[PDB]
C-alpha cells in the first residue's frame, strides 16, 4: 500500500522538478540572446521585449501541463 | 457551494470580456478601417484619372 | 606617425568584426595606400 | 466538491456523448463496441460558418462592406495569400480545403473556453425533462468536442489525399524507395539483421508515423486544455479565480497557433507529395 | 530620429545627410541600420545600397566594393 | 473504431460541399486590386 | 495490483515530464536564434514569424504524443 | 502483473527518451537554419528543401521507438 | 513507515534539482549578459532592468517546487 | 517471469538511447551543413557527399544496438 | 531500517546537486567574465562589481539546499 | 535464477547503447567541425579528411570493447 | 541495519562523487576561457591570474564543505 | 551470490561503458577544435598533432584505469 | 551481507566513474582552447602551455580524491 503512495508522491515530485529545469534552461537561453540583441539594437527594444514575452509564453506550455498533473496527484490523490 | 463556484466563473468571464474589449478590438478595428479607406482611395484615384 | 599620435584614449566601445579582423585590416591598408597614391597624383598634376 | 469530484470522474471521460448503437445511449457500456455520436455537434458548429460565409458569397461586392463582411474578407484574403505564396501543388481546390480545415480546427478547439460545469448545471433541466437523470449523473451531458477520433479521421483523410496525389504523380515506386547509407556490418548475425529488415522498416514506418503524430497533436493539445479547465473546477469559493484567467489567455494564444501550424504542415505534405519523387 | 550617413569615395563623396534606415550587403551578414545602433564595421559586397529617409522615400546607390563604419 | 471511419468520410463530404464558395470569395477581391493597376495605366497613357 | 497501478503512474509521470523537457529546450534553441535574426533584419518580420511557426510545429512531435497516451493511461490504464 | 508494469515503464522510456532527442535536434536545426535563411533570404526555398530532407533523415529511428512502444502497449509480446 | 522517507526524498529531489535548474540557467544568462554589458557599458542600467525582468520570470517554478517540498515535510500529505 | 520484462526494458534502452545518439548528432551535423552551404551555395554537391559519408560512418553502432534489441524482441535469450 | 537510508540518500543528493549546480554556474560566470576583462582591461572593478552582484544572486537556492541538508543531518524528519 | 541472467543482459545492453552515444556524439562534433573547415578552405578537403580518419580510428575503440563484452555476455556470459 | 550501513556509505560516497565531477567540469570550462583570454592578452597575465585565483577559491567552497561532511560520516557515521 | 554476481556485473558495466563515453566525448571535443586549428593553420600541423596526442594521452588515464578495474572484475572479481 | 557488498561495489564504481568523466571532459574543454590559442599564437606556446599544466593539475584534484577513496574501499571497504 505504502508502495503506491510513495510512487504517487515521487511522481508528483517528478512532474514539477523536471519542468522547472526545462523552463529554466529555455529562459536562460532566451535571456542571453535577448540581451545581446538589445545591445545590438538598443532602439527597437519594445517589440524585442514583445516577441520575448510571446515566445516565453510559448515555452512553458507542456511543463505547465506537468505541474498541473502533479498538483492533481497532490490534492485529488488519484488511485488513492 | 455550486452557486459559489458558478458565480466565481461568471466574475472570471467578466474580467475576461473586460480585457477582451480593451485589448482585442483595437487592432482589428484599425486594420478594417484602414483597408476600407485605402480601397476607397484607390477607387477615387481611378475616377480622377478617368476624368 | 599620427598612428600613435593624435590619440588620448582607447574607446571602451569597439566594433564587432564581421569578417576576420586580419583580412579586414589588410584590405584597409590596400585602400589607404591606393588613396595616398591617388592624392599624390592629384597634387603633382596641379604642380605641373 | 467531493461528490462533485465523483460526478466529474464519471462525466468528462465519456465517449461520443455516451452513445452506442444497438445498445443504450446514456450509460450503455464501458469501452464496449460503439460509434461516434458527438462529432455532429461540431459538424453543425461548422455549418454555422458555412451559412455565415454564404452570407458574404451572396452579399459579395467590390466596394466597402459592413464591418463583419470586411473582417471576413480580411480572413479570406489572409488565408488565400498565405496558402498561395507559401506553395501550391496542383491548382485544384487546395485553397478552399486549407481555409475550411483552418477554421474548423480553430473552432473545434475554440469552444473549450466555456465552463465544463455550466453545461450540466443548465442541461439538468432538459435531462430531467426527457431520458432520465441517473445515467445523466453517470455521464450523459454534452462535452465540448474532445474525442481524438475526429483527429484520426482528419489525419487519415489527409493521408488519403496524399496517396491520391502520389498515384497522380505516379511516384509510388520511388516513394517506396528510400536512401539507405547502411550497407555493411563486420559480423554475420548483425549483417543478417541489417540487409532486409533494417531498411524495410525504414521505408515502411517513416511516412506512416506522421499523420498519427498530427492526429495526436490535435488531441493532446485540446485534451490538455480540457484538463486545465477541470483542475480549475476545484476550490469552490476560497479561490479568487484570478490565476485561471492568465492561463486561459495563454491557451487562447495557443489555439490559433496549433491550428495554423496544423494546416501549414497539411500544405507542406501536399506540396512534397506534389513534387517529383 | 535620423542620423548622418556619408557616402564618400576616394575622389569625393556621393551622398550625405541624416537618415534613419539603411540596407547594406556585408562581407558576412546583410545589415539593416538604425540611428543609435551599436558601433560596427565590416566589408561590403559590391552591390547596390538602399537607404530610407523618414519622408516615405528610399534612395539607392550602386557600390562596387568598400567598407562600412 | 466505427466512429473513426465515419468521422473520416463525413468530414470530407462537408469540405467538398463548401469548396465552390471559398474560391468565389477569393476571386471577388482580385478585381479590386485590378482597378488600381488600370488607373495607373490610364495615368501613363495620359 | 495497486503496485502495477503505481507502475503505470510512474511511467506516465516520467513520460509527460520528459516531453516537457524536450519541448522546453527545443523552444529555447529556436527562440535564441529567432531574436538574433530579428536583430539582424528588422524588416524581415513576416518571413521570420513564418519560418518560426513552421519549425515550432516541426519540433514538438513526440513529446505531447507520449503526454496524451500517458494521460490516457491515467484515465484508462491500458491493462487491468 | 509485475511484467505489465515492467513493460509499461519500458514503453515510457521507448517514446519519451527519443522525444528528448528529437526535440533538441530539431531545435538546433531550427536555430541554425533560421540564422542561415536570415543571412540569405534570397536562398530560402531550396534550403528549406534541404531542411525537409534532413528532417526525414533524422526522425527515422525515433519513430521506430514510438512504434515499438505502441506495439507493446496494444499487445505486449510477453505475458 | 516507508512513506516517510519516500516523501522526504521526493521533496529532496524537487528542491535539489530546482537548485540545479536555477544555478545553471543563471549561469547561461550571466555569460551573455557580461558579454553585452561589456560591449555597451552605457546601457548597463537598463540592461540590468531587463535582467531583473527575466530574473523574476525565470525561477518561479523552482520556488513552487521547493515550497511544495517543504509542505510535504511539515504539513505532510500522503499520511 | 520477470526475465521477460527485464529483457524488454533492455531492448527498449538498446533501440531508444541510440536513437537519441542518431538524433542529436544528426542535429548538429544538419545545422553545420546548412551553415556551410549558406557560405558556398555552389559547393552543395560535395557538402552533401561529405554529409552522407560522415552520417554513414555514424549509424553503425545504432544499427548494432537496434538489431540486437529486435533479436531479443523476437528471440530473447535467458528464457 | 529503510527510512534511515532514505533520508541519508535524500540529504546526500540535496547537497550533491547543490554543489554540482554551484560549480558549473560559477564556471559559466567566470568564462565570460574573464574574456570580457581581457577585451576591456579598463573597467575590471565594475565588472567584478556586477559579477558579485549576480554571483550572490546565483547561489541562493543552492544555499537553501545546503540549509535543508544540514537541518536534516542535525534535526532529521520523523525518522 | 532470474537475477543473474537479467542483470547480465541489462549490463551488456547498457554498455552497448551508452557507447552508442559515445560514438554518435564524438563523431557528430568531429564531422560538424570538419564541415566548417571545408566550408572555410575546401582545398584541403582530402587532407582534412585524412585527419578525420585519424580521429575516427581514435574515438571508437573503447565503445567497440564494450560491444564485444556485451556480445560475450549474449553468447556465453562468464557467470553462474 | 547493515542495509542501512551500506546505504549511509552509498550516500557518503555519492555526495563527493558528484562534488568532484561538478568541480572538475567547472574548473575545466573556467580555465579554458582563462587560456583563451590570456592568450589574447599576453601582458595582462598577472592581474588576470589574480582574478583567476580569487574566482577559483570562490568556486568550490560548498563542494569542499560537502566533502568534509562525507569524511565526517566516514569517520563518524551518524543516524546509526 | 547470484544477486551480488549481478551487482558486480552492474558495477563492471558502469566502469567500462562509462569510460567509453569519457574517452569518446573527450576525443570528439578535441578533434573538432583540432580540425579548426588545421583549417586556420595548415602549416603548424605537426606540433599541433603532437600537443593533441599529448593532451589526449593526458586524458584517458583514469578511463583506462576504470577499464582495467572492470576487466579485473570480469576475470578475477574481488570480494569473493 | 552480500547485498551490502554489491552496494559498496556499485558506490565505488560510481566514484571512480565520476572522477573519470571529470578528467576526460574537462581535459577536452581545455585542450580545445589550448590548441586554438597555440595555433593562433605559436609564440606564447611555452608560457601558455605552462599555464595549461598549471590549470590542468588545478582541475583533477578532487577527482583524484574520489578515485583514491573508491580504490581504498575496493581494497579496504569501510563499515564491515
Residue numbers in the entry:
A (entry chain O), G (entry chain P), L (entry chain S), M (entry chain J), N (entry chain G), O (entry chain H): 1 to 80
B (entry chain p): 2 to 52
C (entry chain g): 194 to 241
D (entry chain a): 15 to 291
E (entry chain e): 2 to 70
F (entry chain b): 7 to 52
H (entry chain Q), I (entry chain L), J (entry chain R), K (entry chain K): 2 to 80
Quote the study on this structure.
State 1 was then used as a reference to build structures of the remaining two states. The central stalk is rotated by almost exactly 120o between each of the three conformational states suggesting common stable low-energy intermediate states in bacterial ATP synthases. Structural alignments of the γ-subunit between states revealed that the three states differ by almost exactly 120°.
